[PDB]
Design an enzyme around this catalytic site. Structure first.
Site, PDB file in Angstrom:
ATOM      1  N   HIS B  39      39.419  28.110  33.770  1.00  0.00           N
ATOM      2  CA  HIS B  39      37.763  28.654  33.691  1.00  0.00           C
ATOM      3  C   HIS B  39      37.820  30.166  34.135  1.00  0.00           C
ATOM      4  O   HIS B  39      36.105  30.691  34.455  1.00  0.00           O
ATOM      5  CB  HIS B  39      37.546  28.861  35.934  1.00  0.00           C
ATOM      6  CG  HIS B  39      36.704  28.235  36.455  1.00  0.00           C
ATOM      7  ND1 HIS B  39      35.769  27.472  36.389  1.00  0.00           N
ATOM      8  CD2 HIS B  39      36.505  29.272  37.384  1.00  0.00           C
ATOM      9  CE1 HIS B  39      34.843  28.299  36.996  1.00  0.00           C
ATOM     10  NE2 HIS B  39      34.884  29.057  37.627  1.00  0.00           N
ATOM     11  N   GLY B 141      39.976  34.683  44.786  1.00  0.00           N
ATOM     12  CA  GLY B 141      41.054  35.360  44.318  1.00  0.00           C
ATOM     13  C   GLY B 141      42.309  34.692  44.810  1.00  0.00           C
ATOM     14  O   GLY B 141      43.227  35.067  43.737  1.00  0.00           O
ATOM     15  N   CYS B 143      42.556  31.810  43.000  1.00  0.00           N
ATOM     16  CA  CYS B 143      42.610  31.167  41.937  1.00  0.00           C
ATOM     17  C   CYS B 143      44.185  31.452  40.744  1.00  0.00           C
ATOM     18  O   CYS B 143      44.318  32.455  40.683  1.00  0.00           O
ATOM     19  CB  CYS B 143      41.479  31.195  40.899  1.00  0.00           C
ATOM     20  SG  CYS B 143      40.895  29.637  39.771  1.00  0.00           S
TER      21      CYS B 143
HETATM   22  C1  LIG Z   1      38.007  29.945  49.318  1.00  0.00           C
HETATM   23  N1  LIG Z   1      39.221  29.893  48.474  1.00  0.00           N
HETATM   24  C2  LIG Z   1      40.126  29.521  48.813  1.00  0.00           C
HETATM   25  N2  LIG Z   1      40.366  28.718  47.142  1.00  0.00           N
HETATM   26  C3  LIG Z   1      39.513  29.082  46.720  1.00  0.00           C
HETATM   27  C4  LIG Z   1      40.058  29.762  45.233  1.00  0.00           C
HETATM   28  N3  LIG Z   1      38.470  29.600  44.071  1.00  0.00           N
HETATM   29  C5  LIG Z   1      38.560  31.247  43.829  1.00  0.00           C
HETATM   30  O1  LIG Z   1      40.307  32.405  43.813  1.00  0.00           O
HETATM   31  N4  LIG Z   1      37.818  31.837  42.415  1.00  0.00           N
HETATM   32  C6  LIG Z   1      36.834  30.510  42.250  1.00  0.00           C
HETATM   33  N5  LIG Z   1      35.978  31.302  41.230  1.00  0.00           N
HETATM   34  C7  LIG Z   1      36.077  32.021  40.914  1.00  0.00           C
HETATM   35  C8  LIG Z   1      35.149  33.233  41.254  1.00  0.00           C
HETATM   36  C9  LIG Z   1      35.096  34.929  40.766  1.00  0.00           C
HETATM   37  C10 LIG Z   1      34.582  35.643  41.081  1.00  0.00           C
HETATM   38  N6  LIG Z   1      35.018  36.631  39.983  1.00  0.00           N
HETATM   39  C11 LIG Z   1      35.078  38.173  39.991  1.00  0.00           C
HETATM   40  N7  LIG Z   1      36.130  36.609  39.320  1.00  0.00           N
HETATM   41  C12 LIG Z   1      36.297  35.391  39.926  1.00  0.00           C
HETATM   42  C13 LIG Z   1      37.483  33.794  39.668  1.00  0.00           C
HETATM   43  C14 LIG Z   1      37.364  32.935  39.611  1.00  0.00           C
HETATM   44 CL1  LIG Z   1      38.020  31.508  39.577  1.00  0.00          CL
HETATM   45  N8  LIG Z   1      37.463  29.095  42.630  1.00  0.00           N
HETATM   46  C15 LIG Z   1      35.646  28.875  42.313  1.00  0.00           C
HETATM   47  C16 LIG Z   1      36.285  28.013  41.400  1.00  0.00           C
HETATM   48  C17 LIG Z   1      37.363  28.299  41.037  1.00  0.00           C
HETATM   49  C18 LIG Z   1      37.949  27.582  39.676  1.00  0.00           C
HETATM   50  F1  LIG Z   1      38.604  27.049  38.898  1.00  0.00           F
HETATM   51  C19 LIG Z   1      36.994  26.491  38.976  1.00  0.00           C
HETATM   52  F2  LIG Z   1      36.962  24.959  38.806  1.00  0.00           F
HETATM   53  C20 LIG Z   1      35.466  25.754  40.135  1.00  0.00           C
HETATM   54  C21 LIG Z   1      34.731  27.238  41.192  1.00  0.00           C
HETATM   55  F3  LIG Z   1      34.353  26.431  41.762  1.00  0.00           F
HETATM   56  C22 LIG Z   1      37.685  28.908  43.449  1.00  0.00           C
HETATM   57  O2  LIG Z   1      37.782  27.875  44.857  1.00  0.00           O
HETATM   58  N9  LIG Z   1      38.468  29.805  46.899  1.00  0.00           N
END
Ligand SMILES: Cn1cnc(Cn2c(=O)nc(Nc3cc4cn(C)nc4cc3Cl)n(Cc3cc(F)c(F)cc3F)c2=O)n1
Ligand SMILES: Cn1cnc(Cn2c(=O)nc(Nc3cc4cn(C)nc4cc3Cl)n(Cc3cc(F)c(F)cc3F)c2=O)n1
EC number: 3.4.19.12
Lengths: 299, 297
Positions: B39, B141, B143
């Site tokens: 991702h 953050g 992930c």
């Molecule tokens: C509240 N919560 C609990 N667990 C998570 C995990 N999570 C995450 O940390 N990040 C995600 N999206 C990103 C956005 C970004 C914005 N910037 C600047 N960089 C980013 C990197 C990421 Cl990965 N997501 C969403 C998500 C991550 C995936 F790997 C996926 F396959 C689908 C998804 F919808 C996320 O869930 N957040």
């Protein structure tokens, strides 16, 4: 929302084994000093009623076997500071983190690195109880395991484990060797004072519940600080100070629920019980999360 | 009994940050490879329905910013395996532990090292739910944070965190990039299936109570496994597998209580409740302690 401990790596690199004759426990190696419970100098016989100044004068540096993994560290000096023995060794620990020794107050939390024979075994979060015990998870051989907090790569060591009480709770010292609570480092049955519930922590955990979507216990009633404290004291809860109200400020702001409104919710839970319902999957009111613990895990 | 994590130091030394453009997450640095969710190659406009094959072809080694703290690790090769990106770097991690990659079954527990921007923040024990989610504690953050067990200095990596589901539970992959459960790595609303109770772990918890002398629930009955499995499913409990019966062996031996006799005791509790009585100071049956957890304590 889980009990969450600090990453233990900075402390793992400091754990060693200390042996005196047959007696063995865990020590903490920082720079060129190993800190450990002085109980290590006791034989089986000595443990029941030790005179530590007497036992220590009859000791030599070479009586102390310190093992860091497989490597032996040579003791070149020793001294006692209250219930903690300080062994000076001829090697500095290259893995020594930035650290401080702190004495915590009841209700504050810390991570425990439980160790056996100098090897780390598990890590979990604990709280200093109002009666100065901790409800830990410790087995034989855990003596000398430490509790700590980490802020910006500085490890604040606050607890060194000594003993399990007959009720299964645990007693220990700060890293200056002073016990938390009215206990002594002797193998004799010791009871703690009657424990109470950490009110400010229960409120923080209720805010955690609301932040995580569980609101069934909220109400439209309210209370003054003094009338809440009257009921709290009745139920063996610690008083809530205005300082505690201030510390809950960030959580009240985030949720839009005034602190005294959450107090009224808790008052009702104390008076009515939970009616078989649960809060964050718990059938009982949890009091081992501080307001900072909740803010850090929810923000 | 409480949830205890493994000491996290061996995994902390492997956490790094991986950035593509502004998209940033956590990676795992073992020998000269960094593993992270693919991702990361999504721009914010790609996250809804990414074409990962098309996104990877536009990518070159020099597009990937991998950092251990503030120290950049130069990427010398990249490939995708299922839902994980594998970035070959020019430096073998000197803190690499003995490790393996394993795919766990529901009910198995593991420690999670929650990380943000490559920096470990906290550690806690988790269980894989029967619906292949985990009831974790993760913020934005996180992930790429990983889950693991440690056995005799060997780290078995079993989970890499990808996303949060609408119900607040979490979904991820093994370290070969295969999701646990019917999820995909797109930022679309995916619902977790209906969850069930982890029977093998409830049984472990009953053995733990017996070990500590709390044994009022031991009845005079026995059952067959097939009979018990059919009843269990009517109470939203998981059926037992042959592997489950076997991992209860040690606790059965220690207590002298046959697995099938304990199943019969559990069946009685499902059909009658607890009548105000508690087990290990709890009115609720705990299902996130495995038989290994119970003996571990
Ligand atoms: C509240 N919560 C609990 N667990 C998570 C995990 N999570 C995450 O940390 N990040 C995600 N999206 C990103 C956005 C970004 C914005 N910037 C600047 N960089 C980013 C990197 C990421 Cl990965 N997501 C969403 C998500 C991550 C995936 F790997 C996926 F396959 C689908 C998804 F919808 C996320 O869930 N957040
Ligand atoms: C069940 N449990 C939970 N926590 C603890 C901690 N604990 C401990 O690990 N060890 C103790 N006594 C020792 C016996 C030894 C036998 N050998 C060969 N070596 C030994 C070393 C020790 Cl420390 N104790 C008891 C105890 C330890 C003290 F430091 C103390 F001041 C009084 C005590 F009664 C113990 O509680 N066990």
């Amino acid at each position: 929302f889980r009990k969450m401990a600090f990453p233990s790596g900075k402390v793992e690199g400091c754990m060693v084994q200390v042996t005196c004759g047959t007696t063995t426990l865990n020590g903490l190696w920082l720079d060129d000093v190993v800190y450990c419970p002085r109980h290590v100098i006791c034989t089986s016989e000595d443990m029941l009623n030790p005179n530590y100044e007497d036992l220590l004068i009859r000791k030599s540096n070479h009586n102390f076997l310190v093992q860091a993994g497989n490597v032996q560290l040579r003791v070149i000096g020793h001294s006692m500071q209250n219930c903690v023995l300080k062994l000076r060794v001829d090697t500095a620990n290259p893995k020594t983190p930035k650290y401080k020794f702190v004495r915590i107050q009841p209700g504050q939390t810390f991570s425990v690195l439980a160790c056996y024979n100098g090897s780390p075994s598990g890590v979990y979060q604990c709280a200093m109880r109002p009666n100065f015990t901790i409800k830990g998870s410790f087995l034989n051989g855990s003596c000398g395991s430490v509790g700590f907090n980490i802020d910006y790569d500085c490890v604040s060591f606050c607890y060194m484990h000594h003993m399990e009480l007959p009720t299964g709770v645990h007693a220990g010292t700060d890293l200056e060797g002073n016990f938390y609570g009215p206990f002594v480092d002797r193998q004799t049955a010791q009871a703690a004072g009657t424990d109470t519930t950490i009110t400010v922590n229960v409120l923080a955990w209720l805010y955690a519940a609301v932040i995580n979507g569980d609101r069934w216990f909220l109400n439209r009633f309210t209370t003054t600080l003094n009338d809440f404290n009257l009921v709290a004291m009745k139920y063996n809860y610690e008083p809530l100070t205005q300082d505690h109200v201030d510390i809950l400020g960030p959580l009240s702001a985030q949720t839009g629920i005034a602190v005294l409104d959450m107090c009224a919710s808790l008052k009702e839970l104390l008076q009515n019980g939970m009616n078989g319902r649960t809060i964050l999957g718990s059938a009982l009111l949890e009091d081992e999360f501080t307001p900072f613990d909740v803010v850090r895990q929810c923000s």
